[PDB]
Point group: D2
Chain length 200, copies 4
């Protein structure tokens, strides 16, 4: 339904000085695009949407490592918060994929929620949705923190979107650039003095 929080092309983002930033990343980042707390507030709402739509059956929460781990944890924490303060409640099991994970035979007949960090071309998720559906789940839904407006898009749209962003390489909140920037709490844009430095 919703395209998520839409971030425009001309969005300047925030100065790093305005926030508390992991200072081993001072000169490598351009601006802060999505502050940690903004992600949290958005994730809280997403959690309520997920429960409204899939909270009528047992849910299997599928975390796509590594970039999705932070989103996955916070999303589940907000779901768990709903489940212990409402009369409506569904049990959840958790799984982790990259390669690994449990036998996807456990997905049969269950409500599967795939949790991803970002959709670019959409190829990764199409491949994943292809492989999951061959085990006939009761329901497959996909929640992605980010969706990128890009000419290379297939045209796939996930079921839950946190943020729709421009075609710029974002890092932070578990999103990496060659395994760097994962320990950053905010989603920020990597600079050239950060790209060339951490390249390859």
């Amino acid at each position: 339904r919703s395209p998520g929080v839409v971030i425009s092309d001309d969005e300047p983002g925030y100065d790093l000085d305005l926030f508390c930033i992991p200072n081993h990343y001072a000169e490598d980042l351009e601006r802060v695009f999505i502050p940690h707390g903004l992600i949290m507030d958005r994730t809280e709402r997403l959690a309520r949407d997920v429960m409204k739509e899939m909270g009528g059956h047992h849910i299997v929460a599928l975390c796509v490592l590594k970039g999705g781990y932070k989103f996955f944890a916070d999303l589940l924490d907000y779901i768990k918060a709903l489940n212990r303060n409402s009369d409506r409640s569904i049990p959840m099991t958790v799984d982790f994929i990259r390669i690994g994970g449990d036998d996807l035979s456990t997905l049969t007949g269950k409500n599967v929620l795939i949790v991803e960090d970002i959709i670019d071309t959409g190829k990764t998720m199409q491949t994943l949705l292809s492989l999951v559906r061959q085990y006939n789940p009761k329901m497959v839904k996909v929640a992605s923190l980010l969706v990128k407006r890009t000419p290379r898009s297939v045209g796939y749209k996930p079921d839950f979107v946190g943020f729709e962003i421009p075609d710029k390489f974002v890092v932070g909140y578990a999103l990496d650039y060659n395994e760097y920037f994962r320990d950053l709490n905010h989603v920020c844009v990597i600079s050239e003095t950060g790209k060339a430095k951490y390249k390859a």
Copy 2:
């Protein structure tokens, strides 16, 4: 030095549907203006700034009720987080004051005083308060305000710590109110036309 997070005049804010909003305010709000989480992030840095400038002597944190209570609580929580996770720290003491003055209290003498306010608009409230505080000779007076409005009506006061500098729009939430309502709202938001009419006094 820092004017805080500058919110542009053409800032659209956020559609309500994207966030979790209290049901009884569903039709009373127009947009989410400053999301609760953004306030926390900015406040976290603000706590570090305060500790850099005032972390030398015993401080008295003065809360300007009612609107400042949320910001007061969170800012103190962030400062306390620093105090218990760092080598050197500074002991704090808390006082409360409401202005027409209804609160107390002369205890500010010789102490580092941190006044915590929700929003500076014309500057009169703070000017008055600062005169009343300087009446009793504190070692230092500092003001942290969550919001500072850009308005021609401004006398020209600028606090030492600012979270967000905003346009001349009437905001509510995060303890800020409209005729005592909307204090029970985490986000800073803009009132709808129906909302203004419903809670009009």
Copy 3:
């Protein structure tokens, strides 16, 4: 529900097991109630309150100074419920201390669901007075939420409607509870060391 009961011989926790402000390092003896334990109890307390007072407009009344942390945290959890359910109720806030100095005219309490938030009940005198006073303005309901309740011989016998913890007859500090204005800037509820009790004596 008397809340979480703490026995008279509860040793508490060694300070070395938790993160405490170093400027209180030699001023405290044991951690009595960890801050996180307080939050969890407070989460359940918020649900109970809405279950009982969610019917009509709520006026939350904070008893300064000691109750500000509990008040802010209790109301945060209540707000979390209000924006995640289909049914929510408006809530206005007020601040008093500790006669009633400061605060709005108590006539505004007329007809509303009044919820009084206090840090600690000892003799019960402070609360019984305030209750009798508030009842004069004929509100639909008056309920008292208190973080702590002491088991003391001096007790008149008042029992609040919502209790976080029932504690022994020791003097505790932290979570906005003070010893001569000190220790309010402490996250955990703790007991004072004799060295600290002597340092901040009045």
Copy 4:
């Protein structure tokens, strides 16, 4: 520091004193370790880690699945220290499932939910020693007192618990009770319903 010690006669907490998920209302006996208590212990655990390993680049290795919640929180506190200190030391994240999932010349922080016999941690240690790093330390949320123990004692311990079977906070019982804030003790009805 042997961590927080929970005695054998620990009655735990009555479920009615806390907020608990509906679907586990009868599957639980007592709340054993409140979520908030876990956070407070973890916060102090983070400063212990930074005291010991915070001079060099750390690689935090998460042990799936049970350790994921403790791993996330412990990292958040370390990251919080890291962006409030003056000497911000970088850290990378790795994941391993025990061997389904899965450094040389780096500092490794292994993060685990619970030490029981030590068989899991023993294997992982010998499986990490092969890659030859600089330093390896182990952080475990729980260390269970048991006669079936090899006698391994990790470098960082949150809580020392009696020989009871606890669930919650990503610790499971046949993959259930992971969606639970507090560490709790299973009810006998719960053992029967979710048996495999």
